[PDB]
Symmetry: C2
Subunit: 272 residues, 2 copies
Amino acid sequence: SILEKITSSPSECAEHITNKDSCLSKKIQKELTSFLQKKETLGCDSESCVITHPAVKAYAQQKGLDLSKELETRFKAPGPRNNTGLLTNFNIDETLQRWAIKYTKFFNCPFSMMDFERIHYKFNQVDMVKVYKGEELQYVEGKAVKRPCNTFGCVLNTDFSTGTGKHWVAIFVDMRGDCWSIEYFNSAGNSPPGPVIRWMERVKQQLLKIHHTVKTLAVTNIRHQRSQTECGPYSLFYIRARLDNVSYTHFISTRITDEEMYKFRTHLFRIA
Amino acid sequence: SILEKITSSPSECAEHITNKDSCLSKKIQKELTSFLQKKETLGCDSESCVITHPAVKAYAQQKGLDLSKELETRFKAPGPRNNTGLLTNFNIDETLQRWAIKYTKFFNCPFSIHYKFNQVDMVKVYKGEELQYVEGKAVKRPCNTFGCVLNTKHWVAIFVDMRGDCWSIEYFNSAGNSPPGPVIRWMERVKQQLLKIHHTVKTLAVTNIRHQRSQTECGPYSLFYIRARLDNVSYTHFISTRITDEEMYKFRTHLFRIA
């Protein structure tokens, strides 16, 4: 249901790719037409599996084709697409970097300030006002970028606060509407840790310098997740749904199942 | 001020065009390189003047070059760019249609004694169910902004902001005059519709300041408010600080080409 709301699809091509049918460049389509049409005999059922096959890698090295750039620029990030394996910081960082291509007013948090309570004591911190004004460095594709952003997104691990282990939660700052909101989404329904509260409060004072209505909000009313594996997909789906203008009130009043989030893995990662 | 904040510029190329050296497509740019370099010998200093010069129109009349398609699709609309001539509904309709090309989530008011646009459903506009023509193609797309410039400072601006967490329905009058009864009725009807899909919807009249002291700039003022709201300038800036008619004289150079 709600998976139909957002603008993603199970295709493994990059979201900004208009072709949609084939993810490969038209040159790479030509040079590898022999391998692509016998992909089943290579043990493959996708273009990403073909250009990662060792025989295709050798043929590409012969002809001077950069297959690694094809995977980074025209395909979605690699990750547990068809299994329930836990998301890593690399799966999340490389996914948010790709969404920043399509959503050009979206600020994806860097890799260092991703999953750490130490963000209050890190040497260089993010300034949400400088984010809004376009004066903060973000990394879109593999390139540094400064641009005005009215949305901010980050996924962090709450394992620093005592718990069973890795648990991803999402943080989203919506500066598009007349009332800006700093949002904390926990699929399990647990309140934010103290350090998260201080960070949300600090961002509110900053944003109150350039806007009149700023709310801090803990989206922890419903325990959506009953599995032990989908907190990663839950956190990424919240950011994507908010980017596609699904209100946070939907995550407050209506439950989102682990089945829907397991299917969301096919929207996140390529077949690799 | 706010004019430096918005994304427009005095260039006569279309907003959705990414080329900055020239408005012309790189194919027309090559075949007209002889006429383009002798601009002054033709009496021109702009590209729109060149591809409309009868000598250039006759050269491109030999090969299969459609200078009319370049003029309509690659340049801003013709209008009073350098004078204080009053804006027509044609100048306003053509400008709003062009902005819908760059702002893909913007629904422009369809232009078609007394008329009224009560035929619109804002919920259908938000969900992508209202037909609109963008770049000459009939499409349906989810729009979170709605803009209209209507006549009652007779030109006024209506802007609906459905981005983010709290939505607003806005009426702008650069002379500082309150909206009439029928406008208030429309704004209250649209608020009732939007309250079915959103929790907070605010209705607002932006009439604090009499911005316009001249007799000519009600048109540019209305288009400027919509463009500023599209580029995320809060309505509060039009309430707290005055925008002079001199800035609207400069904004005319952002709106139209020479023709």
